[model samples]
Target: LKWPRDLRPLAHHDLLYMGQISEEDRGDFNATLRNFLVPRVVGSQKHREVREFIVRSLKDLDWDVEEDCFDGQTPHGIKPFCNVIATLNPSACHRLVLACHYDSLLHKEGTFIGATDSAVPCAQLLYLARSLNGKLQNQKTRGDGLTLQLVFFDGEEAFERWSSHDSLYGSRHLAQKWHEDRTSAERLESCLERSEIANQIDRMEVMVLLDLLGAENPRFYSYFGETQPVYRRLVNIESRLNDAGLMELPRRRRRTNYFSNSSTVGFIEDDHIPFLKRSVPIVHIIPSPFPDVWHTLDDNEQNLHHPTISNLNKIFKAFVSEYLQL
Candidate 1:
């Protein structure tokens, strides 16, 4: 058990306990979270540990995991890298894809732990995988019809600088693979010609990408004005969580007179962008007011909110159930 990012020792004890995090696990979780900060990118020693953690966790849950090693080039163009692909149930037609990037940035000053950037989501996804397995086993009553594919992307953090050409190597490869698989006039073409199968893979019910969800007070704002339907789905989940008393709306911070008057902006370049570009309905779960620790050496387990993880799990489970029902 790890202390979530926000309920760290620096925060008030009463508030931390109110989040329902165990005080006993705080120290151990802090150490583990710090260990993850050790600069893990494709081809690094730390990278292997992160990858192994994901693999072993999934295997322990009895998932048939498959590792796809996609050749990736370093920013300096000197080395090759790989991305790990793990799937719990691949045979089911109607699928739900959950993705997160595991790679940390290459900057050497201090390894970015990226707790909020992705580690929290990675952990939550593992929890979801375990719960989903149980639901599938009891499908006689639960009837979770959709299969889940959890993709741990590599090289999402920019090695050089954030740009279309420099970032999102893992998602780009996956999107391209999906496009090729669908359009290729080879074996896949014949399969798609099957009336029963054609409609299935042609559209994914949804693609949910989680990033920057470790804030002490998390509030997800709707992104991409044109993408209201997708945002609506997420908002609906948030509303349901509130109604169910799982969590409350985050407190809105007040603006000072010195605050600059910038128009509300929602353009975020994350792994979800690739799926959205492919016309897949995507939900980018991110916290508002990017934490002060973001992309900095300070971004560690100290910033995570335990209740946020629990609430995210509830919302995700509900969303999956609803999607599977359709």
Candidate 2:
């Protein structure tokens, strides 16, 4: 049977393992969001606190963590930032990346807590990783599957206003490094000789970025046609979860704003810009028309709806489970 554009549909029960996220996980997700609610401005010590929180959470989940340290050059001066990645089953060649910016907006004026802007996305991924931990450990190794990596990027917000040079500092730097810093000739040749792995590992297939979530009737536009497949996958998962009454699905209304679900306006600049330029398929999970309280002091925990968080938590967990075939 065919479905309307509003209801993005797909099948269920594809995974061998159960993909249900418990109520305890929901409480932890909320707490993690509150924990990283600091200003987290780049080039400040508070940014260090955000990094540490991610490290501590990853450690607790028993995922091997790697902190990619680098200094991002802006117009004013060099800004120090660390990009953290918690890898599961590092031995797997093909990889799946779920990333979100950990740093909040850098405003010199007043206290700005970006709840839906990115803080929620960061915490959501953390909890999702935690939920997927045991199921992954149960499996021995992959025959031909993707390895999961959760990346928390710093300095995503510009010290000044958003600009090509200033914005996406951490992601711009890491994409270059991840592309260049590959397995050496010896390792690749050795692996080929052994005939252990089926596919030759090169670059990540796609980077699913979650940003600017927690709006009442949020709608995300698929920027590139290349990314629509994954975008449709997300929509399908959301529709399914709502049908089961497990979560509340956001209404899809036509909005003229650029970078929204209405097939609307400009090449929006975000953390994914750098990765998208590098030929990596990008699935940006950002709401369009933007959040009402975006980049303002009003963007706090109270502004964020709990039901939206719960719905997103369910959608992402189910999508990741089905995509990884876990």
Candidate 3:
């Protein structure tokens, strides 16, 4: 397929899983989680294995996958870092990105799995790709629109201290790389000239970064005002899922509201920073007052709540589906 984004008619095909969640999906979620519930600190062999696992998983779904490998100067020393990027349709002029850091913090005391810190987030993205592969392929054939892009960032965790230069290694590189990609501007049709998209970074509609997730009853707030409208869409999707009894409610609480109605001015520093600096609207889906086991070894799979993960997975699937109009 070539340029000039247009909504062409898609070839008819039976969808395997879209617009609905199944009981088997929970099993698939757990299976995927099990694979990620390990110590995968950045620069370690396990980390490389994890990246390959994520790449293989997305490639199996036929997504356009690429590995951004580079070296970053860390507090410890210079170390290698890699970012995994998967796009449903690379030819699409506009993209909606869902991102998570796959690297765990370098904990000196013991092995850090970073289950909630980011492992679960990576699994969530993988699950989304697996579930919506069919619908996304259909969307691609339907012609250019806002397609999905899943990014597994590396080195989001600082080696020693949280400093501006120490964190967000992968994102910083990618945001800058995309910013300089002039080909993105050249591909824009004359009809979309009024949009004033200057480069690849401008092609990103919004970047949603998921972090510190998988724990029970996470409270998500809107950090950026520009993305609040999309945040509200997530809230509505959660409400609808609950009303349909499709989501698993906590035992004591009859209802679960992960997304807060209130928006906040203060935001957590994360992989979204680099993109945000380039003017990409962002929805940071990390919970404030982070998980109890944030950077400790206790942040392993034992602390992960199955019900919460399942509910969040369903919410993500619905949000992606509605966003892409699948």
Candidate 4:
């Protein structure tokens, strides 16, 4: 039920045929990458392709979209990052945050389309934004309260190598900002008068992050190595989807010994970790058994499965709906 302007059908046939090119047509893969995926990262002409896509989609749905740019350096200070945030019902009582990183890894020669690593998640967010706007209006008629925020983070990928300090720049910055705002206000207010910014800090409720969800057949493993509460919540979400016949329960896998005793085990180090560290309960939807095309040039549209994308959307939307009720 997206707003009229925002309701752009995905043209299922086009999506279906996107990956049918033969090896002889390999050159076309680069063209497709250049045309749809390359410009999405910063400094690329196609970067705006993603930006404009999200902006227009949101505006068409009557949601107010805002571009929040930060000059903050990466943890290593090598490059800068940008974060795109869009809001619907900005002032509603119940706030739900949905996020995906839009930045690509800095590898110049590797076949890193980062399509499933991130782009598809961004597209899914756009679809959710449009869908939710329709539902929000209907809920309003029944006097329900819910607010949504969609964030596209940059620098979620590491540079040449994946290092703890080399990735998740945008998410770290946002998390630190939230922490500082909250901590500074408490310290200042305890000593001085109340500040206007204090109210703004109180609105965050929970955050859901989407990543690496474009597999031909997606199997979402529960937060295997994460804290018990977080794992339980995610399992609850999957259970709901199963009960609704939208998705099947993933078979349980034994915990890996490598992740034993690690709080972040099975917990991905993607953009959501930053928020989770700051005490925000996060539901990170990541495709397990990393895709063969991951971080490779082959991670193009062809590797994406539409049914997986559709199911991801359904589960995500259902999670938000149930969370809002609580």
Index of the highest-TM-score prediction? 3
After the best TM-score superposition of candidate 2, give how far the Cα of residue 125 lies from its true spot, in angstroms. 0.7
- Model 3 gets an lDDT of 0.81
**Model 2 worst lDDT window (10 residues):** 1-10
Q: Write the per-residue lDDT of candidate 1 for residues 151-244, one digit (tens) a residue.
A: 8887887778788878888777767776566432232222223223333324354667788776666656656544445555455655544544
Error of 4 at 261 (Å): 20
Each prediction's TM-score against the native? 0.73, 0.84, 0.91, 0.69
lDDT at 93, model 4: 42
Give the per-residue Cα lDDT of candidate 3 at 125.
92
Best by lDDT: 3
**Candidate 2 wrongly placed segments (more than 4 Å):** 1-21, 184-202, 249-265
| Ranked by TM-score, top first | 3, 2, 1, 4
Error of 4 at 221 (Å): 3.6
lDDT of 4 at 10: 23
Predicted candidate 2 versus true structure: per-residue lDDT over 102-203, tens digit per residue: 888866769887888788888888888777777666541654444678888877888787777878888887877876765643343212222333222243
lDDT for position 142 in model 3: 70
Candidate with the larger TM-score of 1 and 3: 3
Clashing pairs in 4: 39-46, 39-47, 111-296, 111-297
Cα lDDT of candidate 2 equals 0.70
lDDT for 141 (candidate 2): 61
